[PDB]
Amino acid sequence: AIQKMTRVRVVDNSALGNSPYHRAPRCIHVYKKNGVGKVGDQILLAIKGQKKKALIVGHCMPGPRMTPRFDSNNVVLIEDNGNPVGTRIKTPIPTSLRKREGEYSKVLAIAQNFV
Amino acid sequence: IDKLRLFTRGGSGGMGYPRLGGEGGKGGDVWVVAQNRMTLKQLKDRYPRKRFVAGVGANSKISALKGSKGKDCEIPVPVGISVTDENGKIIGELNKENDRILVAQGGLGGKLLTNFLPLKGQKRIIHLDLKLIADVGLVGFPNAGKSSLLSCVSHAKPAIADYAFTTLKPELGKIMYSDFKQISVADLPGLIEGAHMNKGMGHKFLKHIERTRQLLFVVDISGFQLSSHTQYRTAFETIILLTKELELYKEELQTKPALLAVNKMDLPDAQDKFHELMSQLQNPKDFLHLFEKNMIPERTVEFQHIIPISAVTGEGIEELKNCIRKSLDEQ
Amino acid sequence: APWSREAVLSLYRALLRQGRQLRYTDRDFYFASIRREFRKNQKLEDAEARERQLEKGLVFLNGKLGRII
Amino acid sequence: KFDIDMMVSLLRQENARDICVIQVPPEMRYTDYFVIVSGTSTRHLHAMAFYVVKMYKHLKCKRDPHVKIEGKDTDDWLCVDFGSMVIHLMLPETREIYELEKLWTLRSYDD
Amino acid sequence: LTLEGIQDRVLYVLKLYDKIDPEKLSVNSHFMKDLGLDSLDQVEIIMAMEDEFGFEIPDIDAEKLMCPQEIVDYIADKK
């Protein structure tokens, strides 16, 4: 449910993601057919005032009944080529996140653990 | 064998239409690169299917990203390329391989509600003239042995070549320059016999052979009674007739780097004075008279030199053939 | 710096035995990577950092977080 | 079938410049094997990925799900997961900048 | 096996190493002093010697060779 102007607690090893700023990062737009951004899609991201695409991985809102959920809006950056700009994500990530058909493998290995 | 006129399309710009960001692609350029006979080894000279285009730009909309870049187009030729444009004159003037000529047009954008302009992709009118089928068109005489002469004067076996024309592809023969490189010459289409010797394998093919900018007049350098023709048309008489036809066809072409091929030199030897006769026919005004100061019956006196075929002796015949090939490729 | 000096040699020997026991992977590349993980790390490392890296190498010798192929 | 031995044979026939295989245990519920492929160039890596995918497809496993060439847009980065395993094709410089094999071997020992 | 053949194999293995420079490949060729080799380089040389004429060398005895003569004597004694 990553809607417009949503702040996201990005979990990644990217320096700009790690960079403190005047504000924490917030999204601007998402790659969704509806205006509703769920986990597993491309969203905007402001890193030190820099627009960048990212993938929202792990949300807080209630989704499917059997699935797990964190308490925030976790996300991992993506490059203009689509590759992960950062190195690793400390928080474990849900295994069903790859089951969305699309770009999944490049983030499927880089994080520390699997939730 | 003919001249080609193509339209070159370059890169096209992209789109949007995001509130943040902007346009996409740019416009590429048109490059012309001439390559050796190895380009003709892959059959891409009978290609013509109304030219070729290039890539276009991108937009991106998730979430505020701009687009890609454009694409340039390179037009290759099988053997040699002379590049001209729609201005009525050629900028690049060469036919040797590894020569490139570029035409630039680009700088693309996108329409109106973030960062502005209207357009589409770019194009140019290119004209490729190969200066005959490969390097020059050979018009012989009724003693012609140009295929055997080229085979005897070069260690490279002749192959089949093509050109970007609306007609049939003439046969080409490889010549050796004795410099770790090889040049190419072109003959009559189909079965090579010589244009003057009543054969062109077609009337339209004869017109295509006669439309060559650089012509080589093959004739018997030996004696008329010793020529491999019955009845021979005499070396002096047929040579004078062919040279007069070639010179009167165009005075500029006579003053250009055109040559006459010395053939039937496999019977002749070093002491047969075939090279001496070739020099006496090349340095003169293609007649009995050698030099004319003021009163000259021809358009220009002291014309260009003659090319050697079926090479013999060691008085620089290979060097003369290499220089003739270089002058033909110079255009 | 390290937990022990001869323990580093024992770890290198066990790593050499494992790299000679390689099945499908480029064991020469494995040896070069082990050398790079040893030469570029065990030059002037601090005591607590060498202790942590020795614990990591002991876990790698255990290999509980992955088996190479 | 297309097993790990088949993967090694495909890497050898494709002349993989650098191959780094690991057998994934049941500790993690991600795959059964992790492969790192460093090739000659991006065109060469793409050709190797296409050859491996064509071999795994046309060989067997009709009932299995298809695998797409991921990282088809990223020039350096690429991957393709298998029915049981996963390979990732990148440059050896890209593999080192990822440091993936040690990262795949260190469950909690990186930064 | 011939002890001279063992010494020749040890010399061939020492010369086959690309990190080592064949300047003083004598019998008392030390690692840290005659060649300037670290403990990791000493272990690499020990593995490279065990690769061709070896595969049974104990780690305790290989940690203090520090000379081609000692390695040749240990290879003659083990075989």
Swiss-Prot record, chain B:
Transmembrane segments: none annotated. Its main location: nucleus. The keyword GTP-binding applies. The keyword Nucleotide-binding applies. One of its GO terms (cellular component) is mitochondrion. PROSITE patterns: G_OBG, OBG. Belongs to the TRAFAC class OBG-HflX-like GTPase superfamily. OBG GTPase family. This is GTP-binding protein 10. The gene is GTPBP10.
Curated annotation (Swiss-Prot), chain C:
Disulfide bonds: none annotated. Keywords: Mitochondrion, Ribosome biogenesis, Translation regulation. GO terms for molecular function: mitochondrial large ribosomal subunit binding. GO terms for cellular component: mitochondrial matrix; mitochondrion. It comes from Homo sapiens (Human). The keyword Mitochondrion applies. One of its GO terms (biological process) is mitochondrial large ribosomal subunit assembly. The keyword Mitochondrion applies. This is Mitochondrial ribosome and complex I assembly factor AltMIEF1. A motif (LYR motif) lies at residues 11-13. CDD domains: Complex1_LYR_MIEF1-MP (cd20272). Belongs to the complex I LYR family. Assembly factor involved in the biogenesis of the mitochondrial-specific ribosomes (mitoribosomes). Specifically associates with intermediates of the mitochondrial ribosome large subunit (mt-LSU) and is required for proper ribosome assembly, possibly preventing premature association of the large and small ribosomal subunits. Thereby, indirectly regulates mitochondrial translation. It is also required for complete assembly of the mitochondrial respiratory chain complex I. May also function in DNM1L-mediated mitochondrial fission. Interacts with intermediates of the mitochondrial ribosome large subunit (mt-LSU) (via MALSU1 as part of a complex that also contains NDUFAB1); regulates mitochondrial ribosomes assembly. Interacts with MRPL4. Interacts with MRPS27. It is found in: Mitochondrion matrix. Pfam families: Complex1_LYR (PF05347).
Curated annotation (Swiss-Prot), chain D:
It is found in: Mitochondrion matrix. It comes from the Eukaryota. Transmembrane segments: none annotated. Required for normal mitochondrial ribosome function and mitochondrial translation. May play a role in ribosome biogenesis by preventing premature association of the 28S and 39S ribosomal subunits. Interacts with mitochondrial ribosomal protein uL14m (MRPL14), probably blocking formation of intersubunit bridge B8, preventing association of the 28S and 39S ribosomal subunits. Addition to isolated mitochondrial ribosomal subunits partially inhibits translation, probably by interfering with the association of the 28S and 39S ribosomal subunits and the formation of functional ribosomes. Belongs to the Iojap/RsfS family. Associates with the mitochondrial ribosome large subunit (39S) via interaction with MRPL12 and/or MRPL14. The interaction generates steric hindrance that is expected to prevent premature association of the 28S and 39S ribosomal subunits. Interacts with intermediates of the mitochondrial ribosome large subunit (mt-LSU) (recruits the mitochondrial ribosome and complex I assembly factor AltMIEF1 and NDUFAB1); regulates mitochondrial ribosomes assembly. Interacts with MRPL12 and MRPL14. This is Mitochondrial assembly of ribosomal large subunit protein 1. It comes from Homo sapiens.
Curated annotation (Swiss-Prot), chain E:
Residues 4-79 form the Carrier domain. Keywords: Acetylation, Electron transport, Fatty acid biosynthesis, Fatty acid metabolism, Lipid biosynthesis, Lipid metabolism, Mitochondrion, Phosphopantetheine, Phosphoprotein, Respiratory chain, Transit peptide, Transport. The keyword Secreted does not apply. The modification N6-acetyllysine is found at residue 15. It is found in: Mitochondrion. One of its GO terms (molecular function) is acyl carrier activity. Phosphopantetheinylation at Ser-39 is essential for interactions with LYR motif-containing proteins. The modification O-(pantetheine 4'-phosphoryl)serine is found at residue 39. Disulfide bonds: none annotated. The keyword Electron transport applies. It comes from the Eukaryota. One of its GO terms (cellular component) is mitochondrial [2Fe-2S] assembly complex. One of its GO terms (biological process) is aerobic respiration. Mammalian complex I is composed of 45 different subunits. Interacts with ETFRF1. Identified in a complex composed of MALSU1, MIEF1 upstream open reading frame protein and NDUFAB1; within the trimeric complex, MIEF1 upstream open reading frame protein functions as a bridging scaffold that interacts with MALSU1 on one side, and with NDUFAB1 on the other side. The complex interacts with the mitochondrial large ribosomal subunit. Interacts with alpha-1-microglobulin chain; this interaction is required for the maintenance of mitochondrial redox homeostasis. Belongs to the acyl carrier protein (ACP) family. This is Acyl carrier protein, mitochondrial. It comes from Homo sapiens (Human).
